[model samples]
Target: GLDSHELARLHELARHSHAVITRHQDAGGAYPAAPTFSAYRGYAWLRDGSFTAEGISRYGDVASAGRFHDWVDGVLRRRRGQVDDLLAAVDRGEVPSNEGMLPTRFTFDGNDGSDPWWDFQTDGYGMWLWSVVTHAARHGLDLERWRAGIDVAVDYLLAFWDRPCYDWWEEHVEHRHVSTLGAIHGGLVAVGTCAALRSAPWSAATLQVAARIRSLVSAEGVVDGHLVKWLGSSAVDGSLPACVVPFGLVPPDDDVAAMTRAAVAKDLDVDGGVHRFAADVFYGGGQWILLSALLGWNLAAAGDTAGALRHLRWIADQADADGDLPAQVPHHLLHPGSRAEWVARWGTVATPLLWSHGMYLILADELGLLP
Candidate 1:
C-alpha cells in the first residue's frame, strides 16, 4: 500500500494548481504554453497530466481522471500537428534554432519568429508523449483513441531522427546529444510495445516503429555498451535513466542506471535536493526538485523499491518549510546573490507546481515508496 497522507496531500495540492491546466488554450485549439511561457510548457503534458491523472484516479475522481485525456486530446494533440506546419515555415539560411519547434534563446531586433525551430528535438517531447500514452493505456484510456496522434508523432520523430536539434540540456542546436537519442530510441520502443499490454489493434504497427527506432540507437547510437544521449558523444545526463526504466532499450543490468545514480549522487546532492545538470551555466548550480523525482522514477522503473524510497524521503524532508514543494528548492538559487536578490531576478512563483507535486506522488506511488 502507498502512503495515504502523501496521496491526500497531493490531491490537495492539485486543487490549488488550477493554473497548471488553465493558462494554455485557444479558440482554435492550441496549447502554446511554450515560448509564451517557457520551453518547459510541453513538459507539463506528461509530467503534470500523467502524474496528476494517476493521483486523481487513485482518489477515485473519474471526472478529473478524464481531464488528462481531454487536455491532451484538445490541446496537445492539436498543437503537435501545428509543429509540422511551423517546421514547414522555417526560412532557409535562418539559424536552425530560430526555426525549430520551440525557440530556445531570445533574439534582439524582435527576430523572434526567425529561428522558430532553433531547438527542435524529439527526445524530451517523445518521452513525454510515451509516458502519457502509457499512463492512459494503463488506466483504460483506450489506446485506439489516440491511434492517429500516435502515428503522427511517431512519424514526426522518425522524420527528424538524423537532423540535429537542441538536446535535453537545451544547449547547442547543431550537435546531437546522447540523452535526446537515448530517450527517442527508448520512447519509440516503449510507445510501440505498450500496445501488446492493451491488446490494441495497432500492436503490430507500434512494434514496427519501435524496431525502427531501436535500430537507429543500436547501430549508430550505442557507445561502449551504453546508449549515448545523442549521436556525437557519450556525455552522461541525469535524465537518461528514464530511457532504461521504460522499455529495456538499454541493457537492464548495465551501468547506465548505476551511472545515472552516481551522476545524480555526485552532482545533484544538496542536503536532499538534486540538480538537473552538472554545469551551472544558466542559473546558479542549484537543486532541481523535478530531477530528484526522476531519480526516484528511475529507481522505481528498475524495481529498486528501497532506492526509490530513499529519494522520496529526501524529497519529503525538503518539502518547503511550509510543507509545500516548489518547482525548485531554494527557488532561484541559481544567481550568486542573496535569496531576495535571486527571487528578484527570477520572480517569486507559487509552490507545488502541479507537475512537480504530481511527479512526487506518482513516482512514489508507483514504487510503493510513499511515506
Candidate 2:
C-alpha cells in the first residue's frame, strides 16, 4: 500500500497519462508513438497502438478504445486483398521475402507510412487481435463489430507466425524471439477460444497453431529455467516479463515465469527501472518506462504489491514537470559510453511517448490505483 502522498501522485499521473493519449490520438483514431519524435512522427504502430488501446480500455475510456479498434479494423479490412495475395503466393510455391510481408507501421489514414521498414513483424497483428477481442469482452460488446479485421489478421498470422522477424525493439530480424512468439500465441488463443468466434472457419486451426507455437517455445525458447530473449539465446530481456503477464506465455505463478521474473530483475532492472537488453545501445540503453511498467504489471499479478509499487513510483518519478513521460530515462545507462552518439543522431530521447504512458496506466490499474 502506498502512503497517501504516493497514492495521490499516482492517481494524478494516471489521469495525465489518459489525457496525453487522448489528446494526441489522430482524428482517424491512430495513436502516434510520439507526436513530436523526429523518426516516429506521422506514423502509428499496431503493436504500440494495440497496447495503448488496452490501457485506455482499462482506464474506462471505452469510446476512445473503440475508435482505435475501429481504425485498425478499417485498416486491416483494406489489407484483406494483400493478405489474400500473399496466401495465394504461398500456395503457388512463391516464397515472399520478408520485405513482401505486411509492414509494421502505418499512416494515420491506414496506408503504409514509410518506405520499406523491412520490419515484417507478426507480433503486432497478433497483439491487435488480442486487444480487440479483450476490449470487446471487457465492454460486453459483440466481437462482430471487428470480425472482418480479426479474420484477416488471423489468416495473416496462421501463414506467418513461425517466420523469423524483428523483436519488440525492431532489431535482430533473423531470430525468432520468445516475446514475439508469445504475442502470436496469445493472440491466436484469444481469438481461438473467443465464444463469439467459436464458429469461425479458422477457429480450430488457430488453436492448433497456437499450441504448436507453445510447443516450439517450450522446446527451444527457454534457456535454463527461464525464457530467453530469443530462441537459442541465453540472455533475458525486459520484454520477457510481458510474456508472463498480459501475453500469457506462462502464468505469473508458474516456475518458468518465476525464474523469468527473477532473471529480468537480476539482469536488467536497476533501481526499479528496466533496461531493454544487455546489448541495447539505443539512447545508451537507458531504462525504459514502458518496460518498467511491464515488469511491475507482472509483479502485481504475482501478488507482489510492494515490489510492483516500487516500480510504479519509479515510473511516476520519471515524468517531467508538466507530467510528460519520456520514452526512457538516462539516469542509469547500461552502456553509458554510447549515449552521446544517439543523442546527436535523434536529438534527446522522445518525451511524451504514448506507449510509455500507456504502460504506466496499465501498471497503475493493475495495482488498483485508479478509481
Candidate 3:
C-alpha cells in the first residue's frame, strides 16, 4: 500500500475538496468559478461546473450534485427559445455570429454574464449534458428532472458542433478544437444512446451529429496518431486527457488515446503538474491543478494506477496551509516573462479554484483514494 501518512493526507484533501465546493455553491445551485477571484467572481461556467458536479457526483454527495444539475437545467431551460431561434437561423443559411451564440459563463441566476470575450463555446452545453446524464445513471435517479435542459442542449449542439468557437480556457475563438468536439460527441452519445431518452426526436439526431464529429476527428483532428490541440494543429494540451476519459473521444487503450497521453506527458507535463498548452501565459502559464488531475483520471481509467497516484499526490502537494488549491502555481512556468502582467491584471492565481478541487476529488475517487 502507499504510505499510510500520505494516504491520510490525501483523504483529508479529498474531504477538503468536497467541503470547498459545497461551501461555495450558490443557493440557486450555481457553482461560482471562484468566489473571490477578480475576473471569475460572481460567474458560473457550465464547462467548469459540469466537471465540478461530476466530481461531487462521484464523491457521493447526491444533494450537492443534484442541486448543481438543477441549477444548470433551469438555466438551459430558459434558453430554450433562444436556441430554437439560433437553429432556425442556421436553417435559413444565415448562421449567427459568435456573439449571437450562447455564452459559456453566466451570472448565478442565469443572466448572460457580460464580456463577450468567451461568448461562444458549445463544449459546455455538451459537458452539462454529459454531466447530468452521468449523475443520473450513477445514482439511479430519473432522467426527467433535467430532460428539458437536455433537449435544449441537444438541439444547440446538433446545430453547431462543427462551429469554431472558444476552447475550454476561453481562448482562440477562431479554431475548431478537438477537445471541444470530443465533449460534444460524448454528450450526444450519452443521451442519444440512453434508453430512457429514446422517445425524444433529438436523440436520433444527436447520434448522427456525434458520428459526424467522430468522423471529422478521425480525419482532421489527429496529428501523428494523437489528437491535436485543434483540428489542424499539432500541439498537445493538458485538456486532451479528459477527452480520453470523461469525453470518451477515444477509448483509453486505443492507439490514438495512448499516443495522445504520451504526447501530453512529453510536452505539457512538467514535474507531475500539467500546463494548459505550450503557449499559455496566464499567470505565466503555471502548472494547473485541475489539468494534472484530469491526466491522472485518464491514466487511472487506462489501468496505469501508479501514474494516476503520482498525479493525485502532485495535486495533494499543491494544497496550502489553509488547505486551499489555486487554479495554478508559479512553478514550471512555460512563459515566466508573461506571468506578472496577468497577475497585475487579475490578481494572483485564483486560490481555491472550485474546478481544481473538483478535479482532485474526481481523480482521488478514480483511484479509490477518496476520503
Candidate 4:
C-alpha cells in the first residue's frame, strides 16, 4: 500500500548511510574522526560508540561490529603500532598535558597527532565501554579478551566517582552531574547484572562501584526526587532520564518510564526529531542521535511499539538527501535550508558521525523498526 517512490528513496538513504560508515572504519576496525572538531573529537567516546555499535549491530551491519570487535581485540589493548602507540600513551601516563584522550586528533610521531579531545572523560569512558559490553554480550561476542581493559576502566571510574566531570553537554567540569553517574550506574548494570556476562573479570567490582555511584547520586547528587542535571542545578537535562537503557538494574515500570518518555518527548523532542537540550547552540540546539534512540527505547520499553516505529520512520526521513545524520538537526522551529547550507550551518560538512549512524541503527532495532 506504500508508494514505490517513497520506498525506493528510503532504501537509497539507508544504503548510503551504511556505506559511509563502512568506509570510515580504521585499519584497527574502529571509527575515528578528524581532530579539532569541538563536540566530537574523534576518539572512541562512549556514548558515540555505544550509539554507533547499537546502530551497527541493529542494522545487520555485523561487519561494522566485527571491525569494532577487531579493533578492541588487537589494538586498544596491545599497543603494537600507531593505534596501539596512542592507547599506550594513555596507559603509560605519557600523554602531553594538553593532549585530549587516546587516538590523537592531530599527527603524533609522524602519525596524526590530533588529540581526541579530552584526555580522560570519565563519563565517556564508563558509558562507551559499557556500551561495548552490552552490545557484545547481546550479540554473543567473546567477553574474555577485553576484560582487562574493562577492569582498568572500571577502576578508573571508581577512583574518580566522587569527582566532578564534564557532563554530556561537554561544557563544565566542576559539579557532579546525575547524567554522568546515571550512565555509570547503567554501564555497571550492563556488565554486572547480565548473568550471561559473568565471565568478564570486572563484573563484580563494576557492579559494586555502580551501586556506590547510584547511592551518591541519590543522596548528595540528586536535587529533588528526580535526578538533576548537576549537583545544584535544578534544571534537569532531557538526556539524563534515558539512563534506563544502560542501567538495566532497574526493572521497567509503566509510571516512571512513561513519565520520563513523556517528559523528554515534550522537552527535548520537537517536530519529530530530538535535541540534546533546549538551549541555543549550533542551529538552535538541534536534534541528537541519542535523543532519538531515547525516544525509541522509551516507547518500545513502554510497550508502544507503534509509536516507536513511527519515530524511527520519521527520523529516517530526516536524513540529508545523501542519508547523513548530523549531530544536530535544525529544529523545524527554525527555517529550512538546502543540504549544503544545513551542513555549513552545523559546521560539519563531510563527516557523517558514527554516533548519529549508531543511533539510527539502535532505534530501528529497538522496535524492529527497519524495512
lDDT of 1 by residue, 1-371 (tens): 33678656544443433333333322232222231233333333333444455544443444555555454444435556455665454434332343445332222111222244544555644654565565565567665655556655665565565567666656777876655665566556666667444454544655666666667666765666555545655544555565566535655456755665555566456655776555553445556666677777777666677677677766665566545566566633434444555456655533545555556666655764333
Span of 10 residues, lowest total lDDT, candidate 3 = 114-123
* RMSD of candidates 1 onward, in order: 6.2, 0.9, 1.1, 5.5
Residue-wise lDDT of candidate 4 within 247-296, one digit each (tens)?
A: 54244463444555666677667766776654535444566655776677
Candidate 4 wrong stretches, greater than 4 Å: 1-13, 33-44, 73-120, 194-201, 220-225, 332-351
Winner on lDDT (3 vs 4): 3
Model 3 lDDT on a 0 to 1 scale: 0.89
**Each prediction's TM-score versus the true structure:** 0.70, 0.98, 0.98, 0.77
User: lDDT of candidate 1 vs native?
Assistant: 0.53
lDDT agreement with native, every candidate? 0.53, 0.91, 0.89, 0.59
In model 2, which residue pairs have backbone atoms overlapping below 3 Å? none
The sequence of per-residue lDDT tens digits that candidate 2 reaches over residues 198-291 is: 8999999999999898899899889889999999888998999878878887889999999999999999999999999998889899999999
Candidate 3 TM-score, C-alpha based: 0.98
Among residues 3 or more apart in sequence or in different chains, the pairs in candidate 3 whose N, CA or C atoms overlap within 3 Å are: 284-339
Off by over 4 Å in 3: none
lDDT string, candidate 3, 133-247, tens digits: 9999999999998889888888888888998888888888999998899999989989988889989988788888888998998888899989998888889888988788888
